[PDB]
Design a protein around this ligand. Structure first.
Ligand SMILES: COC(=O)CNc1c(C(=O)NCc2ccc(F)cc2F)c(=O)n(O)c2nc(OC)ccc12
Ligand SMILES: COC(=O)CNc1c(C(=O)NCc2ccc(F)cc2F)c(=O)n(O)c2nc(OC)ccc12
Ligand SMILES: [Mg+2]
Ligand SMILES: [Mg+2]
Ligand SMILES: [Mg+2]
Ligand SMILES: [Mg+2]
Ligand SMILES: [Mg+2]
Ligand SMILES: [Mg+2]
Ligand SMILES: [Zn+2]
Ligand SMILES: [Zn+2]
Lengths: 367, 182, 367, 182
DNA sequence: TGCGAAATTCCATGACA
DNA sequence: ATTGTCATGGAATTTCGCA
DNA sequence: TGCGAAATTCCATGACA
DNA sequence: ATTGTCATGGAATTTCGCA
């Protein structure tokens, strides 16, 4: 009000260009701008104006400004608009992101077989012999896969299946998603008893189990092909599919998972016989060099508008199962540590520490 | 002549009948002839049905060129013959009453029978749960002749469960007394 | 067999390079190739070989060849492999496509208001006053939107809602997806009685209703924001949201849907007053030029491996609701007519004519 | 002075009571003063509640600066006053017993009453379904003064339902006889 | 005739079962 | 017989205020 | 030393609730 | 406290068979 009073008499105030005629009409300070005559409201009223304009349809920067510009003008209007957008809790938790996640990591392939198992459940499937699910265990180095039909994605069926698997070898690390079968204390004790380290995906990020998920694709695809024009009796096919995929060439590797695991084909059809004149010790020597020379993909180029997490940044976690007409994002939280360019620890909306993938994060807009 | 390789020959035989453990009475023993790698499958009978059921699990991982066994009824049946023919597995039998296999396999089967005995005493009906840890021990036992364990020869890597603490494999004086009572 | 006999004596046969020694061993013709000694099977046995190799895991080109190459060699092996892949019905209907759809069309914005309505249902939503669905009617030219709460996405609720809407004006064309409410004969008679042409999206292609679907996004987004921390009583908010969105600026157009429809804001907050000194006839003149000068997007660049439909091409329609362990694609069908680079008529798997979007088509591999 | 514009002034009034049609007895008539555009809302009573309910539909499309009406009880209530104040609508009343509006609006309301009468006869209880087609006819009637229909003046475009076949708007000799009986 | 800053435009991103 | 769309907020670009 | 063709590699595309 | 993956089939590229 005092700021605008000095403007009417013609005195200069920083932010208000001097080349315009600021006059008074109907008790309101007005300016004759190119777009027309706009009302210059006192500083003390501008916050309420930006709020009334924003709250009509909770519009973003430009759609809110265009409303205000219809009636008002003042220095740096968008600055006051953006200030409100960053304080509007409903917009922060309901709006989508417009910045993509940084480019994916391609973690190093495990050096040896049994260094890391990836496990996951497929299902529910059509009932077959009373069974509904398939426990899928993929060795990370070799791609070699074990298939177990279960009646539930339960810890008890996981333990029963892995006790049979670990008859052959114990893995260093088992990786799974955060499903109930794998996060239970009963499963943790099972793994601790055998010296196995349990490694979990970040929540709601199946890419992290991509090794097994991708194999799930091949399993369902082969099952589908074998079941065409037949009732879906997939129980008796799991052994067939397991053998078939474990002996299937990966065109980019030029090897089957069986070969990466054993260094020699068994008595399967079209068994490779190149190492027939080598001894087993010479064969294993060639196997050790093959395992180390396998193709490894590199991180792809970042998309043009990607974001990478910074310690201290305000970020928002995606709501897991958002109800109808409910926000898709949690309230803002702070990045505590950056484990890698795609994984962070945040100070959760409940106050807890949470390790999340940035694919389930957006950076809070307007800082 | 071509060097010996894994999956060239599987030696199979039944151990039993044993005390019942969770409804199982026999153990189908499968030993790879080159590596000495052992698979143990609990069955309810030394039948062709039980043998096919257990070997179907194994042959969904690796198929041997040859299966060797004695003239046991489960292995000489026409059903088991049709089963082997369907998978391209040649069946090879030892002469009746002249069971021959291989020094490495003979010694391996000795270890299995002695190891089973050592843990049968004190808990003769809880061996079904112990079969996993028995196969691990068997397959990580150092081979004096090849200077590699069956695990190392099959996978070309060291194992995450090395068994440097060998059992006595003989019955202690207290285990001999508690066995003569059973 | 006769072809291979002349090869053993050293006579040249086209396709078999002369610089190799073709010999006989164990009753099989063999060749000493760089990779090792391979068996050359007679022509009459090669089809069965390619089939046995392919059928292990129904592998594609390279993974099948790598199996065959372990034992056999013959001229142009991949040619025989690809020939089988194009005859394997299970692979054709189960495998994914690796060719993207051509770039999307950006159809011209309707010239006038009421030229074309786009309509669709939102729901089911949380019960509000007994209502579960929202009929959304978007005018194509203006974006101006009418909202009607209904208890079902039914024809009867559609007719009741549109009889109220058409009190204001009758549209030339109503566009909808192929939902039940809009495809019923009862709805067709309703539209024919009023001189309205019913235009339907291709099946299972919500992009075709993108005008309304995009507005559904704004409606749910605003409803969500207004309902934060409240029970989801959205019935009383539909009028609020309708007014709010119809008076919201589109930053790229610089106009609200209300302005594109009426050429002047009503007594809403922050009503634009630029045309206050013009007469209504001068105002409508400026409105007619605004409607014609609106920003129109252009077709984006085609992705590097896109396909465009050709009359006569073998293509496959995507299965609508594929059951578990069932193929995702129908048997091959022929393109009858290309309506536009993104829409075709095909000779359906049932024998009928079907107008489908190419987003629900893949070109049949291996011709 | 600023030229007249749509939404500058809405003229509202009740027509009724009419014969019951699907439970409705009155018609709330809303005419835009500049365009002559007409909205018809069927109500069950000439009450503030019914008026607010119907004007809430209209004011979710466009809000007038001024609503003009007579001193009818539904429009002079404190509830309807609070309703208008909440939407920034100024209420303007004509003098009691001196109903004045506008030549264009006066003539428009004549057309509405005469058009309703013409279609009330023969089916006096089926007018609820006919309100849509009545508004279309009213809003596509050529205006001799402005030389544009209300539709053209409100939307700046021609209409997809031009009404070139004008009703007689007078009662034919057979409709006068069937009306004197009702 | 050019600078710093504000204002406007651009546009990738994502979601509409 | 048909066809994606557009709010969003950082970034890129243009325009403004002043000289 | 270079050509046409076959063979191999490349890699965008899409799907793993 | 953790992280995408890889079969696929046209296209791009390299290698082969021959001279
Ligand atoms: C974000 O996706 C989700 O909400 C997670 N959905 C699951 C998925 C899932 O979304 N799979 C689809 C999928 C999507 C992208 C991808 F890169 C891999 C993938 F498998 C899953 O595969 N498994 O195995 C799950 N297992 C669970 O254990 C209880 C729970 C959820 C999933
Ligand atoms: C391919 O997607 C589908 O299967 C279709 N799903 C619908 C969708 C649907 O998938 N919506 C999501 C969606 C996805 C992409 C897109 F570009 C727009 C869009 F809305 C829909 O919006 N509506 O309105 C539907 N209405 C129906 O009427 C009965 C039936 C289905 C849908
Ligand atoms: Mg899972
Ligand atoms: Mg999964
Ligand atoms: Mg025996
Ligand atoms: Mg729909
Ligand atoms: Mg929809
Ligand atoms: Mg009155
Ligand atoms: Zn907001
Ligand atoms: Zn196939």
């Amino acid at each position: 009000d005092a700021e605008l009073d000095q403007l009417l008499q013609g005195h200069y105030i920083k932010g208000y260009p001097k080349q315009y005629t600021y006059f008074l009409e109907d008790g309101k300070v007005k300016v004759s701008r190119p777009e027309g005559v706009k009302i210059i409201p006192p500083q003390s009223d501008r916050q309420k104006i930006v709020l009334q304009a924003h709250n009509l349809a909770h519009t973003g920067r430009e759609a809110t400004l265009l409303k205000i510009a219809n009636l008002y003008w003042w220095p740096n209007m968008r600055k006051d608009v953006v200030k409100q957008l960053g304080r509007c809790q409903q917009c922060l938790i309901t709006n989508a992101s417009n910045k993509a996640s940084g480019p994916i990591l391609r973690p190093d392939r495990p050096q040896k077989p049994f260094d890391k198992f990836f496990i996951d459940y497929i299902g529910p499937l059509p009932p077959s012999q009373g069974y509904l699910y398939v426990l899928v265990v993929v060795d990370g180095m070799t791609g070699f896969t074990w298939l177990y039909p279960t009646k539930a994605p339960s810890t008890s069926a996981t333990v029963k299946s892995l006790n049979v698997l670990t008859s052959i070898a114990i893995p260093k690390v088992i990786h799974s998603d955060q499903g109930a079968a794998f996060t239970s204390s009963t499963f943790a004790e099972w793994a601790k008893e055998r010296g196995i380290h349990l490694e979990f995906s970040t929540p709601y990020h199946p890419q992290s189990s991509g090794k097994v998920e991708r194999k799930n694709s091949d399993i369902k695809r082969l099952l589908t092909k074998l079941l065409v024009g037949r009732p879906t009796k997939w129980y008796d096919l799991l052994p067939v599919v397991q053998l078939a995929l474990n002996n299937t060439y990966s065109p980019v590797l030029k090897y089957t998972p069986h070969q990466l695991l054993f260094g020699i084909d068994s008595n399967t059809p079209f068994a490779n016989q190149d190492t027939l004149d080598l001894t087993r010790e010479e064969e294993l020597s060639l196997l050790q060099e093959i395992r180390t020379s396998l193709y490894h993909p590199s991180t792809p180029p970042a998309s043009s508008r990607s974001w990478s997490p910074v310690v201290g940044q305000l970020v928002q976690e995606r709501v897991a199962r958002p109800a109808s007409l409910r926000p898709r994002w949690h309230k803002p939280s702070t990045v505590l540590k950056v484990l890698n360019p795609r994984t962070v620890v945040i100070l959760d909306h409940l106050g807890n520490n949470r390790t999340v993938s940035i694919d389930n994060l957006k950076p809070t807009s307007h800082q | 002549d071509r060097p010996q390789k894994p999956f060239d020959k599987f030696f199979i035989d039944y151990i039993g009948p044993l005390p019942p453990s969770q409804g199982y009475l026999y153990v189908l023993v499968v030993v790879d002839g080159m590596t000495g790698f052992t698979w143990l499958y609990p069955t309810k009978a030394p039948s062709t049905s039980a043998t096919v059921k257990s070997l179907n699990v194994l042959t969904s991982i690796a198929i041997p060129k040859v299966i060797h066994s004695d003239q046991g009824a489960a292995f000489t049946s026409s059903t088991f013959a049709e089963w082997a023919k369907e998978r391209g597995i040649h069946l090879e039998f030892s002469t009746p009453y002249h069971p021959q296999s291989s020094g490495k396999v003979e010694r391996k089967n000795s270890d299995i029978k002695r190891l089973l005995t050592k843990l049968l005493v004190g808990r003769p009906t809880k061996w079904y749960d112990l079969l996993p840890v028995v196969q691990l021990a068997l397959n990580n036992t150092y081979s004096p002749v090849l200077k590699y364990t069956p695990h190392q020869l099959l996978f070309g890597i060291d194992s995450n469960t090395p068994f440097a603490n060998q059992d006595t494999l003989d019955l202690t004086r207290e285990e001999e007394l508690s066995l003569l009572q059973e």
